[PDB]
Design a protein around this ligand. Sequence first.
Ligand SMILES: O=C(O)C[C@H](Cc1ccccc1)C(=O)O
Ligand SMILES: [Ca+2]
Ligand SMILES: [Ca+2]
Ligand SMILES: [Ca+2]
Ligand SMILES: [Ca+2]
Ligand SMILES: [Zn+2]
Length: 316
Amino acid sequence: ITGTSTVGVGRGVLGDQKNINTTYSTYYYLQDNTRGDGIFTYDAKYRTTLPGSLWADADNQFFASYDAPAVDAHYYAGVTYDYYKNVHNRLSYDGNNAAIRSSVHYSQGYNNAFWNGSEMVYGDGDGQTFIPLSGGIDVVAHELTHAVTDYTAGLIYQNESGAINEAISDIFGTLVEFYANKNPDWEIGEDVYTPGISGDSLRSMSDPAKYGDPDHYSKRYTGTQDNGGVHINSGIINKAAYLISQGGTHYGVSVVGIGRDKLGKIFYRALTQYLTPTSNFSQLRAAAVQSATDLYGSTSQEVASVKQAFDAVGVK
Ligand SMILES: O=C(O)C[C@H](Cc1ccccc1)C(=O)O
Ligand SMILES: [Ca+2]
Ligand SMILES: [Ca+2]
Ligand SMILES: [Ca+2]
Ligand SMILES: [Ca+2]
Ligand SMILES: [Zn+2]
């Protein structure tokens, strides 16, 4: 759309009020011209055809309950874009300011969200297992990072490379959640999962086993479900990443934490410089070590912690 940039106001999935960037041209659209080539949010109107209609609103106020998921998908995509730009100096997912598109109200009672190779898509949830998925900043950032991976390492979505692809998305989704300071934690999807149950989440990076995911290589899933356990075996990497950041002793191996910022720098470097589409866990470890070496020196503590952390999860 061609029009005038403006700012609107609405309420998100969790009921919080926020301002969002809109464009005015007869209607007010969810089109943010302030970031790269724009962020665009569409209404899929409970259908599965994509992307749907660019979101249009008459008065620039988005307080209807039907509006909530659009408000958050639109807002959280801006935050994520900011994180990448500010923190890693990367312009959008392609590094060249590509437009960011998302659709909401995808299908009926759809308990999922995803990156389809061109855009983000969010279901509204069935109201029991999930509420609308774009209400979780870690979910939004998890999706946008899959775009980042597609344009960089290109990790194939299956088996080990696939689990790495998933872990990357959880790690950066969590780093973004801390960046925005939105009640941050090392859990995944807590804000939109099982509205009826407090305290849980979809996955845990601090203790993957809490939800039955592996936290050691010896416990990896080797069957065929889930594309070869991409959402299961990611726990091994997630745990490694949590250890690098926070420190701890796991299976008798002690890791000194080096903090979130360094975690993010090391992983981003590995992702953008060293990983390839078919990289496996063992290659990820070599990548992460090389990255930390590049950044901090081979005799650094940073390098030492990366090694310890992988040793702790059994990745050699
Ligand atoms: O892999 C994906 O992008 C799909 C999905 C995303 C998701 C993340 C966090 C919470 C809910 C949903 C998953 O099942 O992880
Ligand atoms: Ca309105
Ligand atoms: Ca949180
Ligand atoms: Ca979280
Ligand atoms: Ca819950
Ligand atoms: Zn994912």
